[PDB]
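User: hey, got a sec? need 5-BETA-MERCAPTOPROPIONATE heat-stable enterotoxin folded
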Amino acid sequence: CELCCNPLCAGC
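Assistant: Yep! Here you go:
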């Protein structure tokens, strides 16, 4: 998620 690898991460 710190890389926004998954767009459903918070803030992505």
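Quick note: DSSP finds no helices and no strands in the chain. Let me know if you need anything else on 5-BETA-MERCAPTOPROPIONATE heat-stable enterotoxin.
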